[PDB]
Symmetry: D3
Subunit: 128 residues, 6 copies
């Protein structure tokens, strides 16, 4: 049996929703579904999954001393890193019908359009 | 010798492009600082020192988990740090004519409201009368 | 042959010790040992391994006081603290060879059963 | 016409909730600032300007995690702890003081850098008006 | 068919060049070439690839390419050591080239410590 | 009563270990501050207040700005962001000065922002008392 998929993330997601990787590059077995973001096992066995998800996260403030509206002194406060990755990998035994997907637990994921910044992939290692 | 000197703290949050209205008035010799407008209005023409310290408002990440059938099987975090507190501060010495206004105006961003803690301040005094 | 494992890190580690991934999810072949944090090869062959290890800010206030009552306050602050050290390898192994993740300074965060820090691998080819 | 003006720097590290003892004394007209206590004591009632600049201690601890075969590194990975930067807690006041009133800088948490004789952290003031 | 490689980056890279992983640890099939930084497919099939690139802080982009076509992208953001990493599964034909190339920034040269890595293996042949 | 007071801003970028030449002169009572050298020169012996605020360019990062009397340091300050943000190196002093004494701000590393006429970085002072 040949089960292997790889998809990237087009659109921004936030909150607690399932990440819907819709830029599908590989999908042997047609077991990944871009409308749901879920891999649904059909061949029972042991599977490898990996994911890389880019977070979308700078503050400044200016205070000027003015005389009759004209600036006589300027000052800035500033404290600007924004883009970072939440990545992991697993190996799981999967029965027929099992769903595997990536879920946000708070925060905002970057939508990379067709650039494949955020990805999700998997393949079967052994079939039962 | 005339006596003009003031010192006031900022109670409420301000933001954007507005005059900061320091309303926790600690000193106001000469009564030339007006907490309702945030403006010092010169009475005695002369040379003045002013200084200000304005605290920028600080603030408080993404979790992505792989689940099998809704059960978490791996967790991952990217941490949004940095939105620290920091200060926009300066000092000047200016000649003022009677009726001149001096004030601190924001030019972008969010100033912390300090309640009665006096984190953000504005002060000044006459050095010489004309 | 069937060799594949996956485990997460329950407790915090620090310094220069082996990471003992003790939340074992998968262990085909029983070649990963959660008591030692080590995978020990039994079938010689070529093996894939990967790992993700989660690492676990300063403020200071100075107030001007008049007879102990605050007349002005100030804060200095410079608060990112959680980042990952992760990598992947492919290695040929002989029987008896051990593969494990080792800290070389720093503090690894203990994730309880959330599996923030993980270690997994599988055989690609046996010899 | 009264003459009251002082200026002092912080030689030694302080932390926690203690009074900052500025003991690198540069100017002390009137002898009203006391380095042993960190306190200015009013003797001429009046209106006073004070200002302070206190440097927070900065600090260098990153994490390395390596996959080993038999103790030999076969992959390395670093997660970097950046931040902790030097930064300042500073403010200025104008206050009316009565005789015997004490003015001083007090930490309310954190670690102040000891500057030895470099005068990174400072405290100064002068009388504007006597009553 | 046995195709599997793993290599580390020795020297600092920067700009828009292909990352030439020259510290080769594994190379079953001899299909990886440290002199070019390229895996060249001999056996057509479905391949797994992964990479982890250490930025020396000017942000760093690192993309996996098939024949120059981006198939995965990764950023490490300089707002100062951070990683740009990703994994792909791709069908390859004979002669197809897979490699990691920088899209701006500075990649750290890890000597033989293997901070910056590139690996792959064939999952299925055709 | 002598009248000595100046206030000036920094127009151009500076860097390294040079004297900051604040050349956007707003106030210069007494004509004792010289924008071409960046130096205040004492002509009336007495006790003086000075203050400065130097914005670090946001390209680097640490920057140090020291107030010097005749080249000797009388205050030090550091700006640091180990993100390359704008931040300030600022301090204030009260000093006794003799005739001919020079007071100026000198960089001790890093890059100072050129603020053109916006007066982001400043240097001021005034006489408190004459001897
Ligand atoms: C200190 As600026 C960003 O207003 O040039
Ligand atoms: C400036 As605060 C609200 O941390 O005391
Ligand atoms: C970097 As420092 C304030 O110890 O000179
Ligand atoms: Ca979680
Ligand atoms: Ca942030
Ligand atoms: Ca800062
Ligand atoms: Ca600051
Ligand atoms: Ca402005
Ligand atoms: Ca990071
Ligand atoms: Ca990272
Ligand atoms: Ca190491
Ligand atoms: Ca830190
Ligand atoms: Ca307090
Ligand atoms: Ca408080
Ligand atoms: Ca790209
Ligand atoms: Ca910072
Ligand atoms: Ca940086
Ligand atoms: Ca110095
Ligand atoms: Ca020095
Ligand atoms: Cl003016
Ligand atoms: Cl009071
Ligand atoms: Cl002196």
């Amino acid at each position: 049996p040949r089960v292997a998929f790889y998809a990237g993330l087009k659109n921004p997601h936030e909150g607690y929703e399932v990440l819907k990787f819709d830029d599908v590059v590989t999908n042997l077995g047609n077991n990944y579904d871009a409308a749901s973001g879920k891999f649904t096992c059909n061949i029972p066995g042991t599977y490898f999954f990996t994911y890389h998800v880019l977070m979308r996260g700078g503050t400044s403030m200016w205070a000027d001393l003015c005389k009759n509206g004209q600036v006589r002194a300027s000052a800035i406060a500033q404290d600007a890193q924004n883009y970072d990755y939440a990545s992991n990998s697993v190996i799981l035994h999967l029965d027929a019908g099992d769903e595997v997907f990536i879920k946000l637990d708070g925060g905002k994921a970057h939508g990379g359009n067709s650039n494949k910044y955020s990805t999700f992939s998997g393949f079967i290692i052994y079939s039962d």
